[PDB]
């Protein structure tokens, strides 16, 4: 079981993105109590504006209404109005009130937090003037920074658990983790983005998050790390033979972590191996000429 | 914490080894007396540790040591151990005599 | 290496007559094993995030445990003796033996 | 228990935020004696400008009166004059004077401080220009930066104590405040905003401030921090059984404070626990292994 | 070469006198043994110079 921790940032969900813009040019009348950094819910009034670009088209609709126009002479002058910009919403008011629409109220498309706000009291609004950028955070995103070298340490079967210092009281629940196709050129780090259920908005975007990773490896012989004696030329472990005879044996290390090494070969499951007092014993067998014998027996 | 706060190991040490001294600013006469200008700066509480400044934004919000590390108190590195009567390890000392005396 | 993975001292707290050491270091877990060191996190100058193995190879190996030297050059000894036996003759048989084979 | 004093800053009210732009293109005639950093009040003249554009329609109206056109005919041309952008008050002037309005005057929509002002004499003016950006500061704002860590606490804080160096006397007990949903990334802090009243205009935007917090969390399991043997990942404590021997115990940590760590689990109340990581050697005494030697 | 590479005499010296030492990183127990953490850094080949 490979285990390694990584740093991570809690971020806004980028699939919760909405940059509101006016369908046509006009001027701002009212701007509701709001600003960047605030949290708006789907429906919140952003600002009031007067758009004259449609006045001419709407009146020609009301004209026909009173002059006994055709049913289809309306559906056609309403799409002439539909693809002019005027929102189907503000249009439904036109037909249900028979009055010209001059003042409209832009609202927040999604539940989220405002990150941008370029229009304020007294200005004139333009087709591009982003009235308000609102980013969500319900299924909040959290991305971890994996070093290009340790990349191999992550696979499909890999188990993940998030932990946020800001909240030691909230058990997190990951629902989708992804290994982005590219690697941050700026930090030489693989990007691992995973979205976590933020039901109660207790996991704010920008706060630290620690991602611990668990990864299954190839099936191998497994012994404790205290058991492996490494002299940078030979890998040995002191075996406890049937009779109680301490006999050293050479093994071949594969990888190790969590205080448990893994030999690629050199032993046999069921076999016993010393953990505590391993040093004295090895030394005793070194004096005894055992380690010398074992190495000579080949 | 380092990666997250944009602070390096190199930076923390230099910041640490620059916030644990006392300063003398000469004297200053008044009432025909001699007033000495002392300046605090030694580490005393563990807070003085937690509150080592590493990074300060233009805004005014600083980033302290407590943000990149914990400050636990523990033992040191030993070169030798002493044990008494098998029922406990303790510390003591030997008295060494001036050779000839 | 020195500070992060080693218990490197870096300061002292002045507490009355007493004086205690202050040292910087990573959490023990980050330095448990050789492999651990190969994944030692480093925050490079360019705020890049890499491991110790990305800038070095680490290998286990045996070697000297204490370097005894005499006269400013490295000198290994050779302990030859006899139980009882003679003296003023053996060392002579060797000053000519060694320097002749 | 907690006793921290977060850093904060006085700033303008962003709900009192006006950006005066001309309804239509024109050219500046006279610009009043104002500039960035000045204090203005609702009605303060900003600049005079000539705007040719409503002339066409203003004529259409005046002409209609010269030949008494239909009521709805005038109601119509006056609306084309509004939708075309033109102060509801300047139209009001048109009908009164019965003369085409060529010169106009932009004025401060609300009282505040001129933070921006980029239109002077001899210039022209476009609909995207900014004749004046005026930001109020009556209910002045203060935004403190609280360490991300104690998010679990500040969420349910009763009251803070806002102090400020500039005015050592204007110290009050903030009881209502809005904890923002965003956490700074440069630093890792929470954003806490609060509106303090500025009748005397003493708290000027750009002054340092302090938000004190003296509170204590809900009752939890508490052990002396000097008793928590913590390695990078794994970590326990040293319990003392009835017979007075040592036995390690895997514990989960909530968070420490002033020399005591709140414990999430691992051990129940009462259990005696030694208060020392001094039973191992700081210089690599493999904590996992050194803890093993204590049991058999 | 200095002018062409944007390096100063002052810089080269400081860079040189910071790449010719050895470092000790305490010890590290494992198998109840005492493993010492040595770190290379001395100049040996002329390549280490280049």
From Swiss-Prot, chain A:
GO terms for biological process: copper ion export; copper ion transmembrane transport; detoxification of copper ion; intracellular copper ion homeostasis; plasma membrane copper ion transport; response to copper ion; response to silver ion; response to toxic substance. Induction: Transcriptionally regulated by CusR in response to copper and silver ions. Keywords: Copper, Copper transport, Ion transport, Signal, Transport. It comes from the Bacteria. GO terms for molecular function: copper ion binding; copper ion transmembrane transporter activity; transition metal ion binding. One of its GO terms (cellular component) is cell envelope. Transmembrane segments: none annotated. The cus system plays an important role in copper tolerance under anaerobic growth and, under extreme copper stress, in aerobic growth. Belongs to the membrane fusion protein (MFP) (TC 8.A.1) family. The cus efflux system is composed of CusA, CusB, CusC and CusF. Part of a cation efflux system that mediates resistance to copper and silver. This is Cation efflux system protein CusB.
Curated annotation (Swiss-Prot), chain B:
Induction: Transcriptionally regulated by CusR in response to copper and silver ions. It is found in: Cell inner membrane. It comes from the Bacteria. Disulfide bonds: none annotated. Belongs to the resistance-nodulation-cell division (RND) (TC 2.A.6) family. The cus efflux system is composed of CusA, CusB, CusC and CusF. Part of a cation efflux system that mediates resistance to copper and silver. The cus system plays an important role in copper tolerance under anaerobic growth and, under extreme copper stress, in aerobic growth. This is Cation efflux system protein CusA. The gene is cusA.
Curated annotation (Swiss-Prot), chain C:
Induction: Transcriptionally regulated by CusR in response to copper and silver ions. Disulfide bonds: none annotated. It is found in: Cell inner membrane. It comes from the Bacteria. Belongs to the resistance-nodulation-cell division (RND) (TC 2.A.6) family. Part of a cation efflux system that mediates resistance to copper and silver. The cus system plays an important role in copper tolerance under anaerobic growth and, under extreme copper stress, in aerobic growth. This is Cation efflux system protein CusA.
